Amino acid sequence: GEAPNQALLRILKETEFKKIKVLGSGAFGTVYKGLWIPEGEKVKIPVAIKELREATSPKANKEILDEAYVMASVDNPGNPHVCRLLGICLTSTVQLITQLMPFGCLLDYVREHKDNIGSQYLLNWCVQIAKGMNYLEDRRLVHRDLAARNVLVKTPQHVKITDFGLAKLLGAEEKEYHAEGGKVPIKWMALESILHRIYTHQSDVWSYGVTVWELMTFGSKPYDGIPASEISSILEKGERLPQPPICTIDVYMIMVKCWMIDADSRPKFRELIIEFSKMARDPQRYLVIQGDERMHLPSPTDSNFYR
Ligand SMILES: *CCC(=O)Nc1ccc2ncnc(Nc3cccc(Br)c3)c2c1
Numbered sequence: 001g002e003a004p005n006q007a008l009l010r011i012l013k014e015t016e017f018k019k020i021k022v023l024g025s026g027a028f029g030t031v032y033k034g035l036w037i038p039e040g041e042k043v044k045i046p047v048a049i050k051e052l053r054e055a056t057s058p059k060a061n062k063e064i065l066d067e068a069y070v071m072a073s074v075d076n077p078g079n080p081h082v083c084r085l086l087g088i089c090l091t092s093t094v095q096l097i098t099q100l101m102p103f104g105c106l107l108d109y110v111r112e113h114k115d116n117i118g119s120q121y122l123l124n125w126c127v128q129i130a131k132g133m134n135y136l137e138d139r140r141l142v143h144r145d146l147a148a149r150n151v152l153v154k155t156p157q158h159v160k161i162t163d164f165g166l167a168k169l170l171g172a173e174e175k176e177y178h179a180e181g182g183k184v185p186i187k188w189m190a191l192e193s194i195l196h197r198i199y200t201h202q203s204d205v206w207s208y209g210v211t212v213w214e215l216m217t218f219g220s221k222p223y224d225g226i227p228a229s230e231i232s233s234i235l236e237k238g239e240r241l242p243q244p245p246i247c248t249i250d251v252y253m254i255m256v257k258c259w260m261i262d263a264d265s266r267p268k269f270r271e272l273i274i275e276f277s278k279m280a281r282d283p284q285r286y287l288v289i290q291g292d293e294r295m296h297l298p299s300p301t302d303s304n305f306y307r
Contacts, residue, residue: 002172007075009068012087012097013039019049023104024149028165028183033100047086048100054092064094067165071096074139081132083152083162098162102304106159107148111219116296119287125151125159126212126276132161133208134269137201140170142177144199146207147188148214156297168199176200186231187222191261194232202263208272209258216244216251248286251279 019034031050055061071085087097103109136143145166152160168177178198190206192198210222222241240259243252254275260266279286
Protein backbone atom coordinates (compact mmCIF):
# COMPACT_ATOMS: atom_id res chain seq x y z
CA GLY A 1 0.00 0.00 0.00
CA GLU A 2 1.26 3.44 1.00
CA ALA A 3 4.74 4.37 2.24
CA PRO A 4 5.66 4.70 5.94
CA ASN A 5 6.02 8.16 7.49
CA GLN A 6 9.26 7.67 9.43
CA ALA A 7 9.37 11.24 10.79
CA LEU A 8 9.70 11.53 14.57
CA LEU A 9 8.66 13.96 17.29
CA ARG A 10 11.12 15.33 19.83
CA ILE A 11 9.34 14.93 23.15
CA LEU A 12 11.05 17.49 25.36
CA LYS A 13 11.10 18.72 28.94
CA GLU A 14 9.30 21.67 30.55
CA THR A 15 12.20 22.84 32.74
CA GLU A 16 14.00 23.98 29.62
CA PHE A 17 11.59 26.57 28.15
CA LYS A 18 10.41 29.78 29.77
CA LYS A 19 7.25 31.36 28.36
CA ILE A 20 7.40 35.16 28.04
CA LYS A 21 4.05 36.53 26.81
CA VAL A 22 0.87 35.48 25.01
CA LEU A 23 0.94 36.18 21.27
CA GLY A 24 -2.51 34.97 20.25
CA SER A 25 -5.63 34.26 22.28
CA GLY A 26 -9.02 32.67 21.75
CA ALA A 27 -11.48 30.40 23.53
CA PHE A 28 -9.77 27.72 21.46
CA GLY A 29 -6.21 29.04 21.65
CA THR A 30 -3.73 30.40 24.18
CA VAL A 31 -0.36 30.50 22.40
CA TYR A 32 2.71 31.99 24.08
CA LYS A 33 6.05 33.46 23.06
CA GLY A 34 8.84 31.81 25.03
CA LEU A 35 12.55 31.21 24.94
CA TRP A 36 13.73 27.66 25.11
CA ILE A 37 16.84 26.50 26.88
CA PRO A 38 17.71 23.15 25.37
CA GLU A 39 18.99 21.15 28.31
CA GLY A 40 22.76 20.82 28.53
CA GLU A 41 23.78 22.52 25.29
CA LYS A 42 25.13 26.05 25.07
CA VAL A 43 22.42 27.39 22.78
CA LYS A 44 19.34 29.51 23.33
CA ILE A 45 16.48 29.64 20.84
CA PRO A 46 13.20 31.55 20.84
CA VAL A 47 9.97 29.65 20.40
CA ALA A 48 6.18 29.77 20.56
CA ILE A 49 4.18 27.54 22.94
CA LYS A 50 0.53 26.53 22.60
CA GLU A 51 -1.57 25.32 25.48
CA LEU A 52 -5.13 24.63 26.60
CA ARG A 53 -6.77 24.51 30.02
CA GLU A 54 -5.59 21.74 32.32
CA ALA A 55 -6.87 18.40 31.28
CA THR A 56 -10.17 18.21 33.04
CA SER A 57 -11.31 16.30 29.97
CA PRO A 58 -9.30 13.63 28.20
CA LYS A 59 -11.21 14.24 24.99
CA ALA A 60 -9.47 17.60 25.27
CA ASN A 61 -6.09 15.88 25.57
CA LYS A 62 -6.91 13.75 22.53
CA GLU A 63 -7.82 16.72 20.33
CA ILE A 64 -4.53 18.49 21.06
CA LEU A 65 -2.54 15.30 20.44
CA ASP A 66 -4.28 14.94 17.08
CA GLU A 67 -2.95 18.35 16.04
CA ALA A 68 0.56 17.38 17.15
CA TYR A 69 0.39 14.27 14.96
CA VAL A 70 -0.72 16.00 11.75
CA MET A 71 1.59 18.97 12.19
CA ALA A 72 4.25 16.36 12.82
CA SER A 73 3.48 14.37 9.70
CA VAL A 74 4.40 17.06 7.20
CA ASP A 75 8.19 17.24 7.65
CA ASN A 76 8.03 14.45 5.16
CA PRO A 77 10.31 15.66 2.41
CA GLY A 78 9.43 18.96 3.97
CA ASN A 79 8.46 22.35 2.67
CA PRO A 80 9.74 25.93 2.76
CA HIS A 81 6.24 27.31 3.05
CA VAL A 82 4.88 24.99 5.68
CA CYS A 83 5.42 25.27 9.44
CA ARG A 84 7.19 22.40 11.20
CA LEU A 85 6.37 21.07 14.65
CA LEU A 86 9.49 21.34 16.81
CA GLY A 87 8.52 19.47 19.97
CA ILE A 88 5.98 18.65 22.68
CA CYS A 89 5.87 18.59 26.48
CA LEU A 90 3.50 16.74 28.78
CA THR A 91 1.73 18.27 31.73
CA SER A 92 -1.74 18.22 33.12
CA THR A 93 -2.09 20.39 30.08
CA VAL A 94 -0.42 19.19 26.89
CA GLN A 95 2.01 21.61 25.30
CA LEU A 96 2.89 22.06 21.64
CA ILE A 97 6.26 23.61 20.82
CA THR A 98 6.52 25.39 17.45
CA GLN A 99 9.54 27.29 16.14
CA LEU A 100 8.63 30.98 16.49
CA MET A 101 8.11 33.33 13.55
CA PRO A 102 9.12 36.88 14.66
CA PHE A 103 6.69 39.09 12.71
CA GLY A 104 3.76 37.01 13.92
CA CYS A 105 0.56 36.06 12.18
CA LEU A 106 0.51 37.74 8.76
CA LEU A 107 -2.92 39.31 9.34
CA ASP A 108 -1.58 41.64 12.04
CA TYR A 109 1.47 42.55 9.93
CA VAL A 110 -0.80 43.81 7.15
CA ARG A 111 -2.93 45.89 9.53
CA GLU A 112 0.06 47.67 11.09
CA HIS A 113 2.32 47.84 8.03
CA LYS A 114 -0.29 49.09 5.55
CA ASP A 115 2.10 51.86 4.62
CA ASN A 116 5.31 50.61 3.01
CA ILE A 117 3.56 47.44 1.92
CA GLY A 118 4.42 46.56 -1.65
CA SER A 119 2.24 45.94 -4.67
CA GLN A 120 4.88 43.26 -5.17
CA TYR A 121 4.69 41.57 -1.76
CA LEU A 122 0.94 41.02 -1.78
CA LEU A 123 1.18 39.27 -5.09
CA ASN A 124 4.26 37.41 -3.93
CA TRP A 125 2.56 36.04 -0.86
CA CYS A 126 -0.41 34.63 -2.69
CA VAL A 127 2.03 32.59 -4.63
CA GLN A 128 3.60 31.66 -1.35
CA ILE A 129 0.37 30.36 0.12
CA ALA A 130 -0.69 28.72 -3.12
CA LYS A 131 2.65 26.90 -3.10
CA GLY A 132 2.14 25.92 0.54
CA MET A 133 -1.47 24.79 0.18
CA ASN A 134 -0.68 22.64 -2.84
CA TYR A 135 1.89 20.79 -0.77
CA LEU A 136 -0.89 20.03 1.66
CA GLU A 137 -3.06 18.85 -1.23
CA ASP A 138 -0.22 16.64 -2.40
CA ARG A 139 -0.21 15.10 1.05
CA ARG A 140 -3.89 14.32 0.86
CA LEU A 141 -4.62 16.60 3.75
CA VAL A 142 -7.05 19.47 4.02
CA HIS A 143 -5.97 22.28 6.30
CA ARG A 144 -9.54 23.24 6.79
CA ASP A 145 -8.80 26.41 8.70
CA LEU A 146 -6.90 28.57 6.26
CA ALA A 147 -7.21 32.21 7.15
CA ALA A 148 -5.17 35.35 7.49
CA ARG A 149 -4.51 34.74 11.16
CA ASN A 150 -3.12 31.35 10.36
CA VAL A 151 -0.35 32.50 8.05
CA LEU A 152 2.96 33.30 9.77
CA VAL A 153 5.77 35.63 8.70
CA LYS A 154 9.34 34.39 8.96
CA THR A 155 10.53 37.33 6.88
CA PRO A 156 8.56 39.87 4.78
CA GLN A 157 9.68 37.77 1.80
CA HIS A 158 8.70 34.47 3.41
CA VAL A 159 5.38 33.33 4.79
CA LYS A 160 4.15 30.05 6.24
CA ILE A 161 0.97 28.17 7.13
CA THR A 162 -0.07 26.96 10.60
CA ASP A 163 -2.71 25.80 13.07
CA PHE A 164 -3.71 22.45 11.65
CA GLY A 165 -5.82 21.64 14.68
CA LEU A 166 -9.11 21.52 12.81
CA ALA A 167 -7.40 19.95 9.84
CA LYS A 168 -7.87 16.27 9.03
CA LEU A 169 -5.51 14.00 7.09
CA LEU A 170 -6.98 11.95 4.26
CA GLY A 171 -6.72 8.28 3.28
CA ALA A 172 -6.66 7.32 -0.40
CA GLU A 173 -9.99 7.50 -2.14
CA GLU A 174 -11.77 9.03 0.80
CA LYS A 175 -12.47 12.04 -1.40
CA GLU A 176 -14.49 13.99 1.18
CA TYR A 177 -14.79 14.27 4.97
CA HIS A 178 -17.93 15.05 6.95
CA ALA A 179 -17.79 15.83 10.62
CA GLU A 180 -20.06 16.93 13.46
CA GLY A 181 -18.16 19.87 14.90
CA GLY A 182 -19.02 22.26 17.70
CA LYS A 183 -16.92 25.23 16.64
CA VAL A 184 -15.64 26.23 13.20
CA PRO A 185 -14.62 29.48 11.48
CA ILE A 186 -17.92 30.09 9.64
CA LYS A 187 -16.99 33.16 7.57
CA TRP A 188 -14.02 31.43 5.90
CA MET A 189 -15.99 28.34 4.86
CA ALA A 190 -17.52 27.11 1.61
CA LEU A 191 -21.29 26.91 1.22
CA GLU A 192 -21.47 23.10 1.20
CA SER A 193 -19.16 23.09 4.22
CA ILE A 194 -21.66 25.21 6.14
CA LEU A 195 -24.78 23.43 4.91
CA HIS A 196 -23.78 19.77 4.60
CA ARG A 197 -20.82 19.79 7.01
CA ILE A 198 -18.66 18.38 4.21
CA TYR A 199 -15.03 19.39 3.70
CA THR A 200 -13.07 18.94 0.48
CA HIS A 201 -9.83 20.17 -1.06
CA GLN A 202 -11.93 22.72 -2.94
CA SER A 203 -13.47 23.70 0.37
CA ASP A 204 -9.97 24.93 1.23
CA VAL A 205 -9.74 26.84 -2.04
CA TRP A 206 -12.71 28.90 -0.83
CA SER A 207 -10.97 29.86 2.41
CA TYR A 208 -7.99 30.86 0.27
CA GLY A 209 -10.24 33.27 -1.59
CA VAL A 210 -11.42 34.92 1.61
CA THR A 211 -7.83 34.98 2.86
CA VAL A 212 -6.58 36.90 -0.18
CA TRP A 213 -9.55 39.22 0.23
CA GLU A 214 -8.35 39.87 3.79
CA LEU A 215 -4.89 40.60 2.40
CA MET A 216 -6.09 42.86 -0.41
CA THR A 217 -8.38 44.75 1.97
CA PHE A 218 -5.41 45.17 4.33
CA GLY A 219 -6.78 43.10 7.20
CA SER A 220 -10.40 44.20 7.06
CA LYS A 221 -13.00 42.01 8.74
CA PRO A 222 -14.85 39.69 6.35
CA TYR A 223 -18.43 41.02 6.42
CA ASP A 224 -18.04 44.05 8.69
CA GLY A 225 -20.77 43.75 11.31
CA ILE A 226 -22.74 40.69 10.23
CA PRO A 227 -23.85 37.94 12.66
CA ALA A 228 -22.55 34.40 12.16
CA SER A 229 -25.97 32.74 11.95
CA GLU A 230 -27.18 34.83 9.00
CA ILE A 231 -24.20 33.97 6.79
CA SER A 232 -25.35 30.51 5.68
CA SER A 233 -28.54 32.08 4.34
CA ILE A 234 -27.17 35.14 2.53
CA LEU A 235 -24.55 33.33 0.44
CA GLU A 236 -27.18 31.32 -1.43
CA LYS A 237 -28.77 34.64 -2.38
CA GLY A 238 -25.56 35.12 -4.34
CA GLU A 239 -23.83 37.85 -2.36
CA ARG A 240 -20.06 37.67 -1.88
CA LEU A 241 -17.28 39.87 -0.50
CA PRO A 242 -17.17 43.27 -2.26
CA GLN A 243 -14.33 44.18 -4.58
CA PRO A 244 -11.33 45.38 -2.61
CA PRO A 245 -10.55 48.99 -3.64
CA ILE A 246 -7.01 48.30 -4.84
CA CYS A 247 -7.66 45.20 -6.98
CA THR A 248 -7.51 45.32 -10.74
CA ILE A 249 -10.48 43.51 -12.29
CA ASP A 250 -8.23 40.56 -13.19
CA VAL A 251 -7.34 39.79 -9.58
CA TYR A 252 -10.94 40.11 -8.37
CA MET A 253 -12.08 37.52 -10.93
CA ILE A 254 -9.73 35.01 -9.29
CA MET A 255 -11.20 35.83 -5.87
CA VAL A 256 -14.74 35.39 -7.20
CA LYS A 257 -13.82 32.12 -8.93
CA CYS A 258 -12.91 30.66 -5.51
CA TRP A 259 -16.46 31.32 -4.33
CA MET A 260 -18.36 29.42 -6.99
CA ILE A 261 -21.14 27.20 -5.67
CA ASP A 262 -20.00 24.31 -7.86
CA ALA A 263 -16.98 22.99 -5.95
CA ASP A 264 -15.40 21.86 -9.23
CA SER A 265 -15.81 25.21 -10.97
CA ARG A 266 -13.30 26.68 -8.51
CA PRO A 267 -9.63 26.85 -9.43
CA LYS A 268 -7.28 24.13 -8.19
CA PHE A 269 -4.10 25.14 -6.37
CA ARG A 270 -1.59 24.64 -9.20
CA GLU A 271 -3.75 27.00 -11.26
CA LEU A 272 -3.53 29.64 -8.52
CA ILE A 273 0.27 29.35 -8.38
CA ILE A 274 0.64 29.88 -12.12
CA GLU A 275 -1.86 32.77 -12.27
CA PHE A 276 -0.27 34.74 -9.43
CA SER A 277 3.28 33.96 -10.51
CA LYS A 278 2.38 35.43 -13.90
CA MET A 279 0.98 38.55 -12.29
CA ALA A 280 4.01 38.81 -10.05
CA ARG A 281 6.36 39.67 -12.88
CA ASP A 282 4.41 42.87 -13.51
CA PRO A 283 2.64 43.73 -10.25
CA GLN A 284 2.08 47.39 -11.00
CA ARG A 285 -0.21 46.37 -13.81
CA TYR A 286 -2.32 44.11 -11.60
CA LEU A 287 -2.43 46.13 -8.36
CA VAL A 288 -3.01 49.84 -7.96
CA ILE A 289 -1.42 50.94 -4.70
CA GLN A 290 -0.88 54.62 -4.19
CA GLY A 291 2.80 55.44 -4.19
CA ASP A 292 3.63 51.81 -4.78
CA GLU A 293 7.07 52.63 -6.14
CA ARG A 294 9.67 53.15 -3.43
CA MET A 295 7.92 51.28 -0.59
CA HIS A 296 9.89 50.76 2.60
CA LEU A 297 9.96 47.06 3.46
CA PRO A 298 13.39 45.55 4.24
CA SER A 299 15.14 43.02 1.88
CA PRO A 300 18.13 41.62 3.85
CA THR A 301 16.35 40.92 7.16
CA ASP A 302 18.01 43.85 9.04
CA SER A 303 17.37 44.33 12.73
CA ASN A 304 13.99 43.75 14.34
CA PHE A 305 15.48 43.46 17.80
CA TYR A 306 13.41 46.03 19.64
CA ARG A 307 10.40 44.66 21.49
C1 LIG B 1 -2.33 36.25 15.30
C2 LIG B 1 -1.58 35.66 16.51
C3 LIG B 1 -0.46 34.68 16.21
O1 LIG B 1 -0.73 33.69 15.61
N1 LIG B 1 0.91 34.97 16.65
C4 LIG B 1 2.05 34.07 16.40
C5 LIG B 1 3.38 34.58 16.26
C6 LIG B 1 4.45 33.72 16.02
C7 LIG B 1 4.23 32.29 15.92
N2 LIG B 1 5.28 31.43 15.69
C8 LIG B 1 5.07 30.11 15.60
N3 LIG B 1 3.79 29.58 15.73
C9 LIG B 1 2.73 30.38 15.96
N4 LIG B 1 1.38 29.83 16.11
C10 LIG B 1 1.12 28.50 16.62
C11 LIG B 1 0.02 27.78 16.19
C12 LIG B 1 -0.22 26.49 16.69
C13 LIG B 1 0.65 25.94 17.64
C14 LIG B 1 1.74 26.66 18.07
BR1 LIG B 1 2.97 25.94 19.37
C15 LIG B 1 1.98 27.94 17.57
C16 LIG B 1 2.94 31.79 16.06
C17 LIG B 1 1.85 32.67 16.30
